[PDB]
Design a binder for this molecule. Structure first.
Ligand SMILES: NC1=N/C(=C2/CCNC(=O)c3[nH]ccc32)C(=O)N1
Ligand SMILES: NC1=N/C(=C2/CCNC(=O)c3[nH]ccc32)C(=O)N1
Ligand SMILES: [Mg+2]
Ligand SMILES: [Mg+2]
Lengths: 266, 266
């Protein structure tokens, strides 16, 4: 560990891989430190610009030799750990986590950011209590969306750079697909696509693995949302706005719980 | 002009827009200095890594305030100036310039670089003599092609990021299209697509404006090559290798002339 950092942080045990637990040397507050060895520039620039209760905040950053990104500690661990092993969550807490997931992602998209790696390993939990805040992480591969304008306003441009352009404004739709895969998993405890017909075909065709026996402890509305995010056509697929107006999220009690949790955090 | 530069270069008259003529203060050698006001990082990194008789070499670079890129001076001007105004070049010198253009672009592509802005304004001429060397410029918008590997080696990936992948290895084909538009122009003196049916449709359909009266001072082989580069399907379109084996470039006298010109330059 570089002198500047060890000078501020007492390093400590691994939280998984590398993310370490660490305590601020002056206050003894706990924090987490993501170590990346040698578009981290991109990650940092993003994490500094963004302010949202469901998006992880950066607290510090060291560059000498490896990158160390200092972050909020999330006592609840990654959501991955709640879903491994056909485990699976109670419908009402799926609802609670997914509301938050949709608010976060809506917020990236309104700020011209596509996350591009949404998966349960990248959704963190505030606390060990079932009802809690979730913060999304890992902007290593995100894209910040002016530049249509220069290509279009011409006579030399290949016809496929052209065609390609009428696609502009739909890349964010890969995040919505990803959220639908997360939701599917949370609701059911198994993955919709899986090598357990080949992965590629499965996904392009859009035919997720649907198990009636499993989905039967799940409401019609919830399943209706997943089906609407698992649409292969990016144009027709649900956006985060649509998913937030969907009847399943019209739940003022989960809405209630959430504002309650925002408040506890302040 | 920043002190470090004026200290080395006597600035002078405009060569077009900004590219200035400039003389090295110690030797009085002439050079050109491209001024970009505030992916220049990208341009420089590229120009430093590349060594090819038909690709412009960088000689120096200043960053304080505006970017100044110091380059070879090309006494012949841009090729644009030879083709403005239904002007048009003698077939045998089209051949000579286009050989060189294909060698340069082949060389970018073998080095994983796509140029992405080939146009006559970006082909420079060594000398004011009809038979001369051409160097390609302007890497402002180029792409340096590992990363398929991480997306593919999965269960969360939108079906269109997938589909999209079987496109990998064909982006270079936008350079070949562009070269075919350049060739068309050189051979005929008019543009194949033009607002003189709308630009977009023209290009996507691939129906260039073909004038029999004009093309009649042009050989069948030459026109055959253009048709083969103006193909809308990127898979079927000619690569630089194919175009170099095409009967029109099987000319050992132009081949002769060229090596002659390489030699004069040393
Ligand atoms: N996937 C991912 N996990 C991250 C962190 C860093 C953020 N905070 C954490 O508490 C944490 N617990 C275990 C891993 C983490 C992270 O930043 N990306
Ligand atoms: N399009 C383009 N023109 C360039 C240069 C810079 C390279 N050298 C030249 O002599 C020159 N003459 C007039 C313009 C130029 C250039 O670098 N890009
Ligand atoms: Mg990642
Ligand atoms: Mg340019």
């Amino acid at each position: 560990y570089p002198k500047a950092l060890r000078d501020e942080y007492i390093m400590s045990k691994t939280l998984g891989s590398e993310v370490k637990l660490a305590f601020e040397r002056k206050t003894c507050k706990k924090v987490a430190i993501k170590i990346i060895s040698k578009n981290v520039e991109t990650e940092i620039e993003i994490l500094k610009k963004l302010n949202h209760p469901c998006i992880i905040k950066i607290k510090n950053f060291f560059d000498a030799e490896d990158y160390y990104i200092v972050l909020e500690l999330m006592e609840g661990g990654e959501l991955f750990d709640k879903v491994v092993g056909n485990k699976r969550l109670k419908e009402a807490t799926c609802k609670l986590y997914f509301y938050q997931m949709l608010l976060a992602v809506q917020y990236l998209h309104e700020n011209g950011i596509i996350h591009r790696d949404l998966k349960p390993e990248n959704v963190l939990l505030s606390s060990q209590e079932e009802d809690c805040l979730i913060k999304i992480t890992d902007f290593g591969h995100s894209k910040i969306l002016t530049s249509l304008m220069r290509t279009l306003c011409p006579t030399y441009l290949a016809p496929e750079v052209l065609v390609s352009v009428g696609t502009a404004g739909y890349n964010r739709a890969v995040d919505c697909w990803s959220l639908g895969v997360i939701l599917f998993i949370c609701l059911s405890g198994y993955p919709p696509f899986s090598e357990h017909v080949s992965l590629k075909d499965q996904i392009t065709s859009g035919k997720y693995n649907f198990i009636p026996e499993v989905w039967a402890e799940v409401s019609e509305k919830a399943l209706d949302l997943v089906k609407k995010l698992l649409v292969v056509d990016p144009k027709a697929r649900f956006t985060t706005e649509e998913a937030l107006r969907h009847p399943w999220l019209q739940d003022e009690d989960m809405k209630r719980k959430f504002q309650d949790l925002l408040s506890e955090e302040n």
